[PDB]
């Protein structure tokens, strides 16, 4: 019970830690979209 609860805890903490990677990465990808489109227009 306790040995997989360590596997449950280490996964769920790392899942939300890896989830924060996407929130950072999606916002930077979005900034590179509007930067290039306003530049390539002009």
């Amino acid at each position: 019970l306790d040995s997989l609860t360590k596997k449950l805890s280490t996964v769920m903490y790392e899942r939300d830690a890896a989830k924060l990677v996407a929130a950072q990465l999606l916002m930077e990808k979005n900034e590179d979209s509007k930067d290039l489109p306003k530049s390539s227009q002009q």
Binding site: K6, S9, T10, Y13, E14, A17
Partner: protein
């Protein structure tokens, strides 16, 4: 044991985050070092 495991995984991912940003900084330095030469060649024609 969580923060013991959280310390070990994040300390290896920090170097990979920086070295990705380090190599991205070297490529932007090449565009800056080259664009100034074309402006430096403007006074050569003058």
């Amino acid at each position: 044991s969580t923060l013991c495991h959280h310390s070990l995984p994040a300390l290896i991912e920090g170097q990979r985050k920086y070295y990705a940003d380090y190599y991205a900084y070297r490529q932007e330095i090449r565009s800056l070092e080259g664009r100034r030469k074309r402006l430096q060649a403007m006074l050569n024609s003058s």
